[PDB]
Ligand binder design. Sequence first.
Ligand SMILES: CCC[C@H](NC(=O)[C@@H](NS(=O)(=O)c1cc(Cl)cc(Cl)c1)[C@@H](C)CC)C(=O)NO
Ligand SMILES: [Zn+2]
Length: 398
Amino acid sequence: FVNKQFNYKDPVNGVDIAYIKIPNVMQPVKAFKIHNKIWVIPERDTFTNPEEGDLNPPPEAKQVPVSYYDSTYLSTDNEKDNYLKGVTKLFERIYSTDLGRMLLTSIVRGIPFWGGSTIDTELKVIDTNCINVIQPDGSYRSEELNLVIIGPSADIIQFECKSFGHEVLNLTRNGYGSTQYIRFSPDFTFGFEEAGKFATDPAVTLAHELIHAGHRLYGIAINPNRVFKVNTNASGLEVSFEELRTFGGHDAKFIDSLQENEFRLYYYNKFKDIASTLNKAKSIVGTTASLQYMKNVFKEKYLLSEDTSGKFSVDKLKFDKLYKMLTEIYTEDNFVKFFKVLNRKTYLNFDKAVFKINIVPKVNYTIYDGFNLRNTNLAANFNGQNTEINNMNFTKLK
Ligand SMILES: CCC[C@H](NC(=O)[C@@H](NS(=O)(=O)c1cc(Cl)cc(Cl)c1)[C@@H](C)CC)C(=O)NO
Ligand SMILES: [Zn+2]
């Protein structure tokens, strides 16, 4: 992924090290472009939501291990540079896998759809899928992006994948897609069990959120109000459809196949409606690109087919393979296979601890092995992820 190594200090160039302004809906922040369509903001997320940046906790917090609230985290350049280094390692670690390489490839190629004009012959960018990059003269220049890795808000361990919405349009649920703003930190991780056994490889945590940027970027995300089945332990919580697709594994069986049938067709007709909009396109808004460059971008995104007229169609086959890839190949469970790590086997493993970590030094954690370093004691029984055995790399907190 990252071609050049970046330092937070590194001078702004208005190209890949810039001060930037998020769709609001305010002050500029230093952000790094670590790859086409992917920016990292080494700041706490006090921007995406309305004044949801006070860092200070509210009334009664869920406390460790369900919440953490240090107001001071990601305040210092030294932390910010470590943060960037931290996300610049997990990406690569992710890229090193044939699956992560494909996923990231999916994310990069998944340009949000230029669905912003009221007139149905017109291709126009949705400004919410842009950032403003500050130029030498203090002027801003609309830029198109796919995914932003930003710092956590107040609750530091509240990692999520979110997106700006539309007055009418459900951009994550209509095949259009939307710029993603994942709120994440590689400076902490969750402990699970099966005495405090082990710890999550943050690579997996980040892989989870990217499986989200995936579905939301391709506009195939299940509505958050679709929860599921009651196969209770021998009085219990329920899990989101979306979250069950994404973790994968055994639990990705609890899902009514004829609700998956019923979606796999919903996002086919959505894709088809995209193919129509493009065919019916006579104008494009902007200086940037032609109606033909942008029609090929999206031909490329939605794996559309181009006849001799140059009319686009959705191949039911290419679609099924893409849908299978994003929805059921790209899963936390299948990542843990590739990473050769230990992870919660389900979503009902109440992480009983948040640990302080530093994945930056190649003595602590590396791209190839994570914590479980080869030619060390750690490379067996995931003794690298053991909170006990490897107490230096895992310091439980409050
Ligand atoms: C970022 C990677 C995963 C991610 N997990 C979560 O946010 C939760 N993690 S969890 O659901 O796995 C969870 C499970 C249990 Cl039993 C207990 C807790 Cl604290 C967290 C909590 C942080 C919620 C606030 C996710 O799916 N976001 O869409
Ligand atoms: Zn999730």
